[PDB]
């Protein structure tokens, strides 16, 4: 019954539920670790993995706290 919510809260990089997600200015969410690991192995323009939005400087992003609380509440609903 929580399957549409489950896919919506899954990271496009690790294919698992979001772990401390961050949101790009283009409105796309990734695990803080997954997106950091994506932009650490490269340089130059930093591109969004989902829409290839161009960022000449690496964006400084903090964790989407509302999205963290949603994932945490989703896990409880999925376990009980």
């Amino acid at each position: 019954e929580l399957c549409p919510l489950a896919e919506e809260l899954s990271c496009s990089i690790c294919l698992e539920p979001f772990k401390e997600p961050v949101t790009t200015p283009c409105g796309h969410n990734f695990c803080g670790s997954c997106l950091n690991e994506t932009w650490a192995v490269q340089g130059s323009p930093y591109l969004c993995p989902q829409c290839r939005a161009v960022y000449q400087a690496r964006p400084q992003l903090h964790k989407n706290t509302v999205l963290c609380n949603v994932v945490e509440q989703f896990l409880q609903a999925d376990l009980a």
Binding site: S12, I13, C14, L15, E16, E37, T38, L47, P49, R52
Partner: protein, 146 residues
């Protein structure tokens, strides 16, 4: 870490087989796969069954997988060694891409080549000056797989 992402891609690939391909590991190593894609339905690659090799790096999916044809194919962007010169396999790679998406992307490359920046110049030259001769050459190579 790479192995977990590879495992989940394979399990989702086994739970639902996409119509455009069939992929799976070769033996015990899930970092080496063998894939097979079908040619587009209305082209010079009709009914063709093309085998490919998928080699995942240790830093997958943050680095793209090495994908090369083992079946011989007549294409301006695929050389005789099966190497594929494609942007999403190098600079335009995205970690959100899955093997199923890449194999489907390679399928659409067959009927949309780039003859202006080619990997095989003589094949691209035929494509530009005589596409009918190009189509028959590609049709012939699909019947022969060689």
């Amino acid at each position: 870490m790479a192995l977990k992402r590879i495992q989940k891609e394979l399990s989702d690939l086994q739970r639902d087989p996409p119509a455009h391909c069939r992929a799976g590991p070769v033996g015990d190593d899930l970092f080496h796969w063998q894939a097979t894609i079908m040619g587009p339905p209305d082209s010079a690659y009709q009914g063709g069954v093309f085998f490919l090799t998928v080699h995942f790096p240790t830093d997958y999916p943050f680095k793209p997988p090495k994908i090369a044809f083992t079946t011989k194919i007549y294409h301006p962007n695929i050389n005789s060694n099966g190497s594929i010169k494609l942007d999403i396999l190098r600079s335009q790679w995205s970690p959100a891409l899955t093997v199923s998406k890449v194999l489907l992307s390679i399928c659409s490359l067959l009927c949309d080549p780039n003859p202006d920046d080619p990997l095989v110049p003589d094949i691209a030259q035929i494509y530009k000056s005589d596409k009918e001769k190009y189509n028959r050459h590609a049709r012939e190579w699909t019947q022969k797989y060689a």
